Design a protein around this ligand. Structure first.
Ligand SMILES: *[C@@H]1O[C@H](CO)[C@@H](O)[C@H](O)[C@H]1NC(C)=O
Ligand SMILES: *[C@@H]1O[C@H](CO)[C@@H](O)[C@H](O)[C@H]1NC(C)=O
Lengths: 12, 562, 44, 58
């Protein structure tokens, strides 16, 4: 399938 | 058979051992019963007894919790006490060879049980065998354990701490006072004990009050410098205050706290002992030795560093699989009816169980340090590793460092490594030469042909008993001159030790030196990490690496799905 | 030694110093990711 | 390396370890090797105590 998506970061 | 002592005459009984006779006096009182107002105080000298006491049966064991994790299983139940529990428990037992020796060396047994449990009346502590075979006198005593032995409010004579240790010391004094009436030599006195017996004896090397009542010392799997052995002064006091809180004894001053605590049932204390520490381990000692100012006038490492201790010969050793006993008492996945194959995550969770307060980098580094595989995948790797971790952390290297540092002041030390797995072990094969399961060999049970041990185990037990007796008599654990392996001294340079098994005993050097080196010279510096970071970049990396490999997974077959 | 350099030391570098190079790397990851719409629009 | 190789997007489309991880390279035989003391030369270029005219006990 079309793949899992990326996760974004938490920046401080 | 009646022997007159300073307190009065005592009657004993003959036992037939290996075609000979031993005279046993079981349950001799050595102190006033610590009841009522004497509860939690230091021991009081025994004044006098009434007529002749018939010391022909074991006494009550002292109050303790009982191991009940495996009902009916001989492996666990053989160490549980087999008589009634009571606060009136300061009694000792003496086994003497018959006929009476004239100037015999005395062996004093100190039971273990992690300072929370144990009793001198176990079958595996019957001293009739050693008395029969080496014609020496053996004495063992019951001493207070747990909070009853070690509740501490230092400076207050109503409960100063280390009471159990002071019981031991007073018992030594009783031995000095009385051993001559038994045919004993007060100038040839040897102490021995295991896991807490060894910690106690080692503390008697440091305690000025103990400075002149014995000659030598045998230490089986243990010493005071282990992390679980001694609690800091204010952690002890804090725990005392917390036990008081749990029991409804939190008060203004100390003496009101003790007044209500002297009225509590022993069972209430036993059921409350387990909550004074927020995150305990299977080796956690709620109430144990501390720097009381009397027994310990300072932190033991400092006293040790300065050479202020009894300068004498020591005998020290350990079993091959010291750590195996504790995993089945809390870690998930382990079972005595399983082969206990665990995963990396189960291993890591075990690490969190046995090392609750250690930083994340500490866990990563113990994990890294213990996975340099000789051979992989080899399924039993993680299981043995975790056992190997606990033992290494808790036992062998502190014992060795103690020996090293003791020998730096010029005295002879001899170290053994017991490597034989008993043919009668009820526990599975994977647990190997377990903690505490050398004592039956120490006490000579395989010499008894009716006991289902092998011939080789009889031979082994004869050889260790012979070398032990020679060490006791002479300070040198030789066996025979000619055709016998000599036991060399442990020196900080060569660090020679003796292997113990039925095949062949031989001399090796620096047992697991690299692992124990890690625990003494790297591990202390790991609790100094103290850097609590935002953890968001750390958790970001945690999700980021899985982002990387889950991203890798796509084009593995994206190229194919065309 | 190489076991140390490949499997322990990187995680040791994982703590000392934390700055926007991680956000630089997320910019790199977003640039790694934004192409996948055409891979989502392969046939669809 | 003051000025050196980088992810230019043309020659190198990503950080190289990732490309390595993904098998995106020429599939052929290679011969690789090293000398025992590659690093010694650099100590006399900054580390205190070292000299090519010393026995450099530190
Ligand atoms: C180990 O014991 C657990 C129960 O404590 C059991 O569920 C598990 O199947 C066993 N694992 C084995 C035999 O590998
Ligand atoms: C090495 O050289 C340094 C300075 O270059 C000097 O201080 C040191 O004494 C030398 N060591 C020797 C000659 O062993």
């Amino acid at each position: 399938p079309p793949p899992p998506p990326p996760p974004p970061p938490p920046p401080p | 058979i009646i022997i007159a002592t300073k307190n009065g005459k005592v009657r004993g009984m003959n036992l037939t051992v290996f075609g000979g006779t031993v005279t046993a006096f079981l349950g001799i009182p050595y102190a006033q019963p610590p009841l009522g107002r004497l509860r939690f105080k230091k021991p009081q000298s025994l004044t006098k007894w009434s007529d002749i006491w018939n010391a022909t049966k074991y006494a009550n064991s002292c109050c303790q919790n009982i191991d009940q994790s495996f009902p009916g299983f001989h492996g666990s139940e053989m160490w549980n006490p087999n008589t009634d529990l009571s606060e009136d428990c300061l009694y000792l037992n003496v086994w003497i060879p018959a006929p009476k020796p004239k100037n015999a060396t005395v062996l004093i047994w100190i039971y273990g049980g992690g300072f929370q449990t144990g009793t001198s009346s176990l079958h595996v502590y019957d001293g009739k065998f050693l008395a029969r075979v080496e014609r020496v006198i053996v004495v063992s005593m019951n001493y207070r354990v747990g909070a009853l032995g070690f509740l501490a409010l230092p400076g207050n004579p109503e409960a100063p701490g280390n009471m159990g240790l002071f019981d031991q010391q007073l018992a030594l004094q009783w031995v000095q006072k009385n051993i001559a009436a038994f045919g004993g030599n007060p100038k040839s006195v040897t102490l021995f004990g295991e896991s807490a017996g060894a910690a106690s004896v080692s503390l008697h090397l440091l305690s000025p009050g103990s400075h002149s009542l014995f000659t030598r010392a045998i230490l089986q799997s243990g010493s005071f410098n282990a992390p679980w052995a001694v609690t800091s002064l204010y952690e002890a006091r804090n725990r005392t205050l917390n036990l008081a809180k749990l029991t409804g004894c939190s008060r203004e001053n100390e003496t009101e706290i003790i007044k209500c605590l002297r009225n509590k049932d022993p069972q209430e204390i036993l059921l409350n002992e387990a909550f004074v520490v927020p995150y305990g381990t299977p080796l956690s000692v709620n109430f144990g030795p501390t720097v009381d100012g009397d027994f310990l006038t300072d932190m033991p490492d400092i006293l040790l560093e300065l050479g202020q201790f009894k300068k004498t010969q020591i005998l020290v050793g350990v079993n091959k699989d010291e750590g195996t006993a504790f995993l089945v008492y809390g870690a998930p996945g382990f079972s005595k009816d399983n082969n206990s194959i665990i995963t990396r995550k189960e291993f890591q969770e075990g690490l969190k169980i046995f090392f609750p307060g250690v930083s994340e980098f500490g866990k990563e580094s113990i994990l890294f340090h213990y996975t340099d595989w000789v051979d992989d995948q080899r399924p039993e790797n993680y299981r043995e590793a975790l056992g190997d971790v606990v033992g290494d952390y808790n036992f062998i290297c502190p014992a060795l460092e103690f020996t090293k540092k003791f020998s730096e002041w010029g005295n002879n030390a001899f170290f053994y490594y017991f490597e034989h797995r008993s043919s009668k072990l009820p526990w599975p094969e994977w647990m190997g030469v377990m903690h505490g399961y050398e004592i039956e060999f120490v006490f000579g049970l395989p010499l008894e042909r009716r006991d289902n041990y092998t011939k080789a185990e009889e031979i082994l037990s004869r050889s260790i008993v012979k070398r032990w007796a020679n060490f006791a008599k002479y300070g040198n654990p030789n066996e025979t001159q000619n055709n016998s392996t000599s036991w060399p001294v442990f020196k900080s340079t060569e660090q020679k030790y003796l292997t113990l098994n039925t095949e062949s005993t031989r001399i090796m050097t620096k047992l697991r030196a690299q692992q124990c080196r890690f625990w003494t010279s790297f591990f202390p510096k790991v609790l100094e990490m103290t850097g609590n970071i935002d953890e968001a970049e750390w958790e970001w990396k945690a999700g980021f690496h899985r982002w990387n490999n889950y991203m890798m997974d796509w084009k593995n077959q994206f190229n194919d799905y065309t």
